[PDB]
Design a protein around this ligand. Sequence first.
Ligand code: ADP
Ligand code: ADP
Lengths: 701, 346
Amino acid sequence: RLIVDEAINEDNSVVSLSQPKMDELQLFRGDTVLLKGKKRREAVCIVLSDDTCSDEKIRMNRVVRNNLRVRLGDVISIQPCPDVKYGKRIHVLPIDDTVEGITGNLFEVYLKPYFLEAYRPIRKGDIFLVRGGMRAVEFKVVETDPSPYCIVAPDTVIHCEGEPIKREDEEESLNEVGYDDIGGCRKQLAQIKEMVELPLRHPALFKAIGVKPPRGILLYGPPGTGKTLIARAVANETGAFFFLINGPEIMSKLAGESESNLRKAFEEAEKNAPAIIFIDELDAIAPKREKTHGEVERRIVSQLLTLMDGLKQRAHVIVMAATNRPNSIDPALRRFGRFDREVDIGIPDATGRLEILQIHTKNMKLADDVDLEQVANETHGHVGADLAALCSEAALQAIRKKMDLIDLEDETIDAEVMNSLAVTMDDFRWALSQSNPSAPRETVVEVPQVTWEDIGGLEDVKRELQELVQYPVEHPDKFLKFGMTPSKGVLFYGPPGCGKTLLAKAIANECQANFISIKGPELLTMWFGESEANVREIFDKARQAAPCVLFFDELDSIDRVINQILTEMDGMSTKKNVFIIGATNRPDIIDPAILRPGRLDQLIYIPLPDEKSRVAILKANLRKSPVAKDVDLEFLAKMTNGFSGADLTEICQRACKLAIRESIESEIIRRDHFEEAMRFARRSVSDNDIRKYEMFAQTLQ
Amino acid sequence: DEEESLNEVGYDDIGGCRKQLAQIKEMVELPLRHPALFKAIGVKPPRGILLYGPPGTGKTLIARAVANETGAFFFLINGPEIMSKLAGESESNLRKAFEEAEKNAPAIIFIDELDAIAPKREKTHGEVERRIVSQLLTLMDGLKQRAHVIVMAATNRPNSIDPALRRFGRFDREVDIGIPDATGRLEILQIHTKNMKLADDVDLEQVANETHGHVGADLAALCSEAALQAIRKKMDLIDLEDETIDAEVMNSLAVTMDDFRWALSQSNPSAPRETVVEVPQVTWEDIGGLEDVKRELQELVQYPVEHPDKFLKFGMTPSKGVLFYGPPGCGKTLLAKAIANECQAN
Ligand SMILES: Nc1ncnc2c1ncn2[C@@H]1O[C@H](COP(=O)(O)OP(=O)(O)O)[C@@H](O)[C@H]1O
Ligand SMILES: Nc1ncnc2c1ncn2[C@@H]1O[C@H](COP(=O)(O)OP(=O)(O)O)[C@@H](O)[C@H]1O
């Protein structure tokens, strides 16, 4: 009686649970349980343990729900290992269309790396796959004769007789995309699953409910974000039929039968309830422009938005919506009932780029020379499709220097050569050496990681900042119980380049919320273009990125864009626990009419860092570039009167560059470079404006 | 009836793209020259390529050369004769122009002048250009990961190319044919003039120099009306026009330098004046002085591009923007030539 969730570990034969489930039916750490399935299907799976598992919510990969032909959330009774014996005389016959003209019987190439000596058990006639060698192949069990569950021994017969047999079609392959395949976006994909599975997993419960149906969700944002595979993956989860209704073949046909194309595209599967439809790139099919100087696109999108209402409170049609940018979509299309609610997939982050690079490389059989961490760092501002392209032609470069230089080209493939082949680090460098930044440089949402000064500011800036940015997220009602709302916004002002931008990143890292980094000039360049709809769009996608904080700087550089900021900030989503923080250096050229309470009005001064704070930011700086063992951190700050964080980064950048400069200059360490770092000529410090900053400080007093 | 064979062409007939020719060969030879190897490839294929740039750069010859190199079937789907039809059968023309070579795997298709057929503008009134770009977008995706057909796309300037046509997956990584330089112009005139038998008094190298910023089609026109200036002085003055065409007396005639100057009297600026990308020919010893700035720039252009493991020894991004401020005209632009030429940078 355990309920299926999704686990982190890729491997089969893994039960990951919390300890009451293993003490409740005398299970141990090293053991095997039987998996009860529908139509008396059985699967074998070895117990492990973990900590991040909801204890009643058992969590695995796709292989056990492909074995039992079950879905996410079913009930499974548990039978331990001593039902069956050791077993021998095994032989594997795989699927024919998994391979494609492949060399040999492949069990000597694949089944011997399958033996990780953990003795993974095998049910008779079950389904399991081993990845590796540039392409995944599933291994059906056909010609084994043990006792009908077989724990695999190294003494058992690696037998290479059988041909790969024809696929039997009650089961759908794991080459079709799954949830763990789309794992790089370990984020709000989980909650959109959590708000779409209910008519899917509970069809009759939604048949007998009077809930006005959630009948459509938008996945806008950057292209190449797997949205087609998002729909395919949720269809492969819940078993609903998927039909991809793409825009250009709809608009390609002549007038009249394009409507009939929409008719078959709607009710080819309304009788196949539940089912999923998908009308991706809605900018190409549904804009609201006079650029579309015609009427066939209007006749397409009209009655599309009203015969998506073919669910007459007894059907189970559901639509995923995908497009580039939501502002170009028609708003009467976006009107409620016709279309209700919105979410963004957005761009992946570098931390998510780590596991998208991990889970894309399950087949290519990487070597041990690479580390995969430094690969994901420089590719900030790239879509995961571009990373898939990157590792794709990395594999193509790796198979390009081999297999024809050796002149192994023939009509038959050589599986052993490409299985012995592996991708390596300079292959990834060569992949980086092509035109990968075609995914452009837009705004980015990211989970922060800087934590050197995550608890607030310097002195009582800490004690106001930490309460302002994480005491609402556990104590909302305590503020109303003692009288009034939390604050709306706080002001950052003082000397520039002191790490205040990184300080807001550490603030967002402390409260475990997202970070918004909008800067001055990219809003200033579209101030001429008059695209403030994009500005409130990025504000709203920050607002639906709850929890988060919105950090903006150089607000004095704009006064119209600031005026639409003051218009949009009236609907303050404090119950969403998002926050607005504003930064500047010159506080007087901006108007004083934005300083009233209930708005951006709290005016704590951000000081220039002290000598002990200079030692602290030096300690933050030396984590990226290591320091000499002979370092006196007060000696580096003994001549600093107003040296900001930018000045110290300017010192360390040029000192490390001079060290790396003279490290190569010998014919073919850094204490002397620290010595010339504090013993150089210039000490260009803007100390004239700290008097003006204190004039403003005691103007506020 | 049969004309001169388009298949029997030299593979070195293009010479003006020998900075990009190597990697376009290196990106196309795997599905083409290795088809039985490529049907076993589980990596997602190269499915798109885009060649923009200046017009008239032999992209037809590029597609013909790579097709005749790999021996695949070649078809050229040209835009005007497929947009000349009425709606409906022009769509069927596009469908049959996609599917005649699906049975001829592996193959190449050439759908040049995409600017004429797939624009990005609000001026696109009507439905016919929408119905042409649509199902082109989806019938390229009709490859079922077993066919080996592949798009070859030629255009001019990819801003006017539609961004949904420029969709990732719909198009892959893209390259530029660029413009040939004068050093490249030397071998393209060397390979073009194998038929005219130029006189030896010229040196054919300084001829390549003053035609900087020109296309090789204009080079072909330059040698063409140079040859006509060479042969205009005979074949009717002395009247060598016999009952046949006296090919021997005109093949005996040679083109020479004043014919090249008279061909230079025509519209050489009909080439589009475009910004040139090229590894320079002015080197480091051509500029002397300001030695502190010299080794500062020298390390700045050598060690970020050739020793990045030293920069990542600490772990540190190298600097990116250096500044030149001082008196104008001293050679700040001139030292850029040397500092790009020494470290083999474009
Ligand atoms: N979060 C993610 N996890 C895994 N793969 C991803 C992710 N985001 C994007 N991809 C990859 O990007 C590609 C998107 O292909 P494409 O059809 O062009 O875009 P979309 O499916 O978004 O319309 C897919 O092949 C998918 O593997
Ligand atoms: N860089 C170059 N090197 C050699 N020949 C060139 C070059 N650029 C242009 N040409 C010549 O110009 C002609 C271009 O003709 P064509 O391919 O029909 O037009 P387009 O290049 O617009 O497709 C070719 O015959 C080719 O010989």
